[PDB]
Amino acid sequence: SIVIFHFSWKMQSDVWGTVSANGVSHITGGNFAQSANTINGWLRDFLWAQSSQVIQSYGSALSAYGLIFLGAHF
Amino acid sequence: KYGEESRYFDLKDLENTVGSWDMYGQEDKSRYNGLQSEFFERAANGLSRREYILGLVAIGGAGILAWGGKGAADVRLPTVGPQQPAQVGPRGRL
Amino acid sequence: AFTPPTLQSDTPSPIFGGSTGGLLSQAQVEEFHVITWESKKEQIFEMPTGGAAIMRQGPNLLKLARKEQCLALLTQLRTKFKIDGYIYRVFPNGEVQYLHPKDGVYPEKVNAGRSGDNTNMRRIGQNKEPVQIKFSGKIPAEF
Amino acid sequence: DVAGLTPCSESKAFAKRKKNEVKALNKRLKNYEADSAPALALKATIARTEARFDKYAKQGLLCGTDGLPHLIADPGLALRYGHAGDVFIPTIGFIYFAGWLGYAGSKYLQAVAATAKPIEKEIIIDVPLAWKLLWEGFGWPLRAFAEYKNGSLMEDDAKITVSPR
Amino acid sequence: YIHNDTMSALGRPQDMFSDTAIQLQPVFAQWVQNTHFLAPGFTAPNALASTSPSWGGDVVAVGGKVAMMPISLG
Amino acid sequence: MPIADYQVFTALFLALATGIFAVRLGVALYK
Amino acid sequence: KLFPKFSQALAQDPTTRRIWFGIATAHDFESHDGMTEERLYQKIFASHFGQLAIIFLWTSGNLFHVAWQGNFEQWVQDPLHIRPIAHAIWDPHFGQPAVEAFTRGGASGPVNISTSGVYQWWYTIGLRTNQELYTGSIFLLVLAALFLFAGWLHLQPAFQPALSWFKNAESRLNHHLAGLFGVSSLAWTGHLVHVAIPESRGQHVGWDNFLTVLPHPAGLTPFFTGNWAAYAENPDSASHVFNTAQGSGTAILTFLGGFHPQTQSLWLTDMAHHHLAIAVIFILAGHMYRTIFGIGHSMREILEAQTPPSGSLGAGHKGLYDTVNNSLHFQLGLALASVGTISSLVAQHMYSLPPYAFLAQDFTTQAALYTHHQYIAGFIMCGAFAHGAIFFVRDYDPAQNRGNVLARILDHKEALISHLSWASLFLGFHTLGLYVHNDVVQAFGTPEKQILIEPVFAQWIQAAHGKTAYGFDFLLSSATSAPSLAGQALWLPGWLQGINSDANSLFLTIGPGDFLVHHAIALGLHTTTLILVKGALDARGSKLMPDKKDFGYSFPCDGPGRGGTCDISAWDAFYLAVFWMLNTIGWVTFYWHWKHLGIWQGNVNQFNESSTYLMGWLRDYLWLNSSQLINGYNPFGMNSLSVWAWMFLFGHLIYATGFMFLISWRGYWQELIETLAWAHERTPLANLVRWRDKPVALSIVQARLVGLTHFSVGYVLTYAAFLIASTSGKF
Amino acid sequence: IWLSGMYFHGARFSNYEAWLTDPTHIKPSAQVVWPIVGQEILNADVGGGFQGLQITSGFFQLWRAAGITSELQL
């Protein structure tokens, strides 16, 4: 779990993104280098910031992921 | 022991058979040179008693409290420095 | 009558390479047990502390930290080798106390001449209620 | 109006919710050609949504502050105001069907308990017997009331194990 | 991590372990990335490019999205 | 009007007195 | 080696389990060696004195810290725009931004903003100055010293009371109801009328001038001539301002009900009248039982006479007097049950009927007080059930409880446990099924397919109070009804104004989400009661372990035989039920906090269409309100909410450290400790030192208790941090 | 059997040919759902005139690497 959390945060912050012919716009915007040394950074900038996609997924195609997100907590 | 063959138990020599050994402790009188041994035993003379070595801890705690009295401020430290304005809050509070 | 066998101190030990599960600091200042058995051939057995040891022809002598290790070795000798043995309790001051085959025959077989203590003549449900023994320092079953 | 609630036939927020759902589905529509399979699927979804909203307005459900149907779970309060189908009628329906299943299982237990090997009959189910008892369990309420009046439904406490207090 | 949490919560960002304060740099891993990046034309004479862009070099972009770009370790 | 130094010192002395009372009660309870 | 002098059996343990169990068995005086019942009860009495002294010292410390480092003077003048200050902070670990971020309510240095509500309470009871608070602290210091001296005195054999004195039930009830309950309430009425009533109206009353100031202009003569209505002449007007003489009055015992318009709290004259009536009734109740004066009741004979014919209750209450009187655990269970229920009542009443001046505007204070009292009530109720299980294990005598209601309820305990299991199973099935169905229909884009059962019964009782919002027009909601006309010149106007206003917490408007969460609360209470009741009733024995009463209240197990006997004691049932209590109080306080968060923002809708499904609970409450909490400190800096962020992560850490003891069990750890003992016993340069006590793994019961303690501590710290941060940072 | 099912779903209930024309913008999908209880909302607007669950298993990329480019071959 820690390995895959590090993978997802590191490549959403420093690898994956869009190009605009003047730079690279990452998914989260380089927040790993200044927040992944703090547990509050993992809880907030990774585990709370990226969780907005699964909790606001009701009424869309990702509603099944939203439902499984709660069923797996159960 | 009497371990001349495969006999590792002996009631007449029960000291060695149990496993009580020195491992590395060896007996030797020679170690520290002259005058300095007397210097250090005079430095730690009367302090060897339990009550006075307790009193050393007592004066150490006195130093701990002396830091709080006058010593925390001598190294600045933010807990005794001044303050710069304030913040109001969410609503009309203070 | 039965007499306990003496612990022959100069008894050979099984061939073994040296383990980390052997004796510790409890042996020097409290107690260490010892087991003695007679083997009819040179063969490999399993140590209670881990690893394999070869017991030799004739008498074999092995000291262990606990009595439970000695009984584990004795029961594996009795099952996988059909070999009986004697266990002794050795205090560090020098006194040796005989242990498991106390009256000669094994405890699972009657001997007619033992102490039948800790044998209540009542049922499980015939013990006293805890309120009737209140403030006594005893459980209801030892009345 | 049974508890400050308005009927969904006349509540404005129910119509607003229906309009919002249909508009969202139309926004989904406005990306495909008219006769594609996704277009037919979205048209069917729209028809189902409009039918559901019109049926909910037709059946006389109560809507709260916004347009969500509310159910009444009080006999009398739902009987004289015509909402017995909210809770009372499904209560009767569940009681009947659950009693059917439970009585069928009970009668299977008492039928196989007096056999040669009751242990085997519970992992290896006698299918014709189970089918017969499932059919017979449709008259569960009358059978259960008859066995209760006969006293053969319950067991005497002197023949049931308890702990020694 | 707990020390970093405590120093951030105490208002002492200069005392936590970070790239901007007390550095803990993966020098062995960074040098291994450099060795891989400099491998073609030197210790990999027949290689026209490194095995992965993660070691170093230009950002690989496909269809406006980054395929693989170098990963920096801090 | 915040309290003075003498009030704090008197309160601390009375707390020392009730601490003596507390350790007396504790010793009586241990015995 | 002789540290647990109360238990020589524990003192002979050569391991760390000796000290571990010495700490934890120190207060089990009944299990101590050489303990008689006289010495038992005397130790109980002296420990009670110690506890009273501790409580008095704690409240004196609160008073001294508010008087010394608080802003009570500034808070009295501006109660709605000044943050109350708990105590100053002196932490040498603070950086400079931490020192700035914690300087808030006009203080010189860093301070903590109080959420305990002591400011509102002290302002309401007439305390105005820091000098008065310091005087109260000094008086409580002296009185705690006096109680310590009394505790020492009654342990002395010249002053040790007899055991029969301890068991004198009729006298103790008579004096507790008449004096401890009644006279104290009468004296509080005296304080309210003499001090709190004039201080509410801008008239200072102190020890220097309370003998020259008149509480009512017609002094004592209306009281002694029976013209008591002259003490309710002119009440405080609706335009009255607290702590000022603007639109005040002279009446000391009004009866209007409702709330003060400015403070949004109960009238103080209503409180004085209430306390006087309570004092009268409690003095009367304390004149009930027989002592030495030839009149009164023998409660044993009352219990004897409460036997219905036809054997409906068996022998009725045959010998229950001796059962209660001889058993300290029965009395402790009754006391804890009642005190926990009263704590729940206090939580449920102070939020909806705010008692203290300028309460229910301090949103953090109300939420913190409610959650505190609810958690205390849950813990105390679990303790009540645990001590009932102990009484079944220890003090229950089947011979003297033969045929009475205790033996009857033990006889058919299987029916009770099975029906609690049925009720819990039904509640869990149905509430979870409705919630999951609502989640699924919400996810699929169809909110109209939700099952929204209207709470018609609770709305009907709300209408019986006068809430004219559901259109019942039942009892007090119809003015023509007899209860409405009976008190229309009494409490009905103010109570109706309170009940029909949406600006307070006097019976909030409820909907389907309230129905679902009330069934969740019912499931929690039912299952916790199931575990606790099953543990009590199976404490003496079960089918798996018939002789469980011989093994005591707490023990690890009975070995892996008979299929396995893990967690078989009644202690283990209490242990399992503490988790369920924590879950139930979590549901209760989540419900309260989310409802009041919707109310305080003016957005009741967020709760109304988000509480019916669990994704709304996770997203619109847990995720949404934690945004300011987790930003208490960040790479961009820190603010005042940093302490609650640190406590949030702290509670998470303690919770998972509890999970460590909860999941892993004693056997892996014992082998690991043996391996480390081997390491240290033959590591060079460390063999010079050795352990005096043999290092062993924690016992099964001990580590269950440790995991439960960490679970509860992490639970409480995490929720307190989240609640205080999400309310104080927002309001 | 599992591999046969994946290839059959790639053949019948997938937008693989459409994805081959525009792999940059069309989201891969190889599973569709039956409209029964409002669950047709899980059929995403993946693209290519197709509705279905967006798959994350990477069969489309593997098949393109193998050089399929046909429904009949799957």
Ligand code: CLA
């Ligand atoms: C048909 C068999 C059957 C019957 C008649 C009952 C009847 C009863 N059960 Mg029980 N139960 C069963 C099976 C059954 N149960 C099974 C298989 C389990 C294991 C999951 C349980 C576990 C269980 C618990 C834990 C409890 C009960 C309780 C109860 C009582 C309360 C009412 C209730 O419905 O509770 C609820 C019943 C369930 C949740 C289980 C239902 C499972 C299915 C639907 C039943 C099995 C169907 C069966 C295979 C059909 C066979 C058909 C036949 C033709 C072959 C009640 C008398 C409660 C009690 O003691 O009340 C005092 C209680 O606490 N049951």
Ligand code: CLA
């Ligand atoms: C009129 C005489 C009298 C009085 C005043 C007392 C008073 C007291 N006795 Mg005593 N006792 C008496 C006679 C009396 N007793 C007699 C005659 C006997 C012999 C038969 C005993 C035998 C006895 C024993 C054996 C013990 C006591 C104990 C106590 C103390 C109870 C603990 C406590 O303080 O909680 C206070 C209780 C209340 C304040 C009642 C409040 C009611 C509920 C719980 C709270 C609700 C009130 C309100 C809403 C709270 C708002 C306050 C908030 C704003 C802060 C208490 C001070 C116990 C003790 O502590 O030992 C010292 C104890 O062990 N008594």
Ligand code: CLA
């Ligand atoms: C125990 C609480 C208490 C105490 C200590 C006092 C004390 C006092 N009151 Mg007060 N008062 C109280 C409650 C209390 N009151 C209540 C509940 C009310 C009704 C709301 C009033 C209403 C009131 C008025 C209107 C006035 C006072 C006044 C006074 C002062 C003059 C004494 C007096 O009244 O003449 C002497 C009283 C008597 C001779 C009769 C007392 C005999 C009674 C009926 C029986 C005693 C039993 C009783 C339970 C004993 C309690 C003991 C307790 C003190 C420990 C005095 C310091 C007067 C004053 O001038 O203010 C400064 C005044 O005008 N009081």
Ligand code: CLA
């Ligand atoms: C008026 C209240 C009251 C009283 C007088 C008693 C009295 C007694 N209880 Mg009891 N109990 C109570 C309430 C009370 N209890 C409540 C509310 C609960 C629910 C939590 C319990 C649950 C309970 C159990 C399960 C048991 C007892 C037992 C006992 C008896 C021995 C006490 C003991 O074990 O030694 C001393 C007790 C302790 C030293 C407590 C241990 C310390 C706790 C667990 C850790 C606290 C850590 C702290 C919160 C950390 C701070 C957090 C911060 C750092 C972040 C004793 C007669 C035991 C017994 O009867 O023996 C058979 C027994 O097993 N109690």
Ligand code: CLA
């Ligand atoms: C977040 C909860 C939590 C925590 C803190 C731990 C912590 C630990 N586990 Mg553990 N575990 C957990 C959950 C947790 N576990 C759960 C839920 C399970 C069930 C599956 C297990 C099962 C498990 C097993 C099977 C084992 C461990 C082991 C260990 C220890 C490894 C040694 C180490 O990490 O070095 C350092 C210690 C820490 C990182 C803990 C925090 C210490 C802080 C960061 C520094 C200390 C400063 C201190 C607070 C200052 C003192 C202040 C003073 C006032 C007290 C360690 C103490 C292993 C072990 O025994 O040791 C090898 C072991 O084999 N755990």
Ligand SMILES: CC1=C(/C=C/C(C)=C\C=C\C(C)=C\C=C\C=C(C)\C=C\C=C(C)\C=C\C2=C(C)CCCC2(C)C)C(C)(C)CCC1
């Ligand atoms: C374990 C145990 C125990 C304990 C138990 C418990 C814990 C119990 C409880 C319980 C509880 C916790 C209860 C509660 C209660 C209460 C009640 C039961 C009440 C009542 C009444 C009524 C009826 C009311 C009415 C009314 C209303 C509704 C409101 C308004 C007013 C009026 C009056 C109208 C003991 C030790 C004993 C014994 C042993 C065992």
Ligand SMILES: CC1=C(C/C=C(\C)CCC[C@H](C)CCC[C@H](C)CCCC(C)C)C(=O)c2ccccc2C1=O
């Ligand atoms: C870690 C662990 C151990 C090992 C035991 C350990 C590590 C105890 C050692 C703890 C040391 C002493 C530090 C504890 C710090 C405490 C905060 C100090 C509290 C002391 C009180 C007197 C206050 C077990 O024995 C065990 C047994 C059964 C189930 C689970 C477990 C288990 O999880």
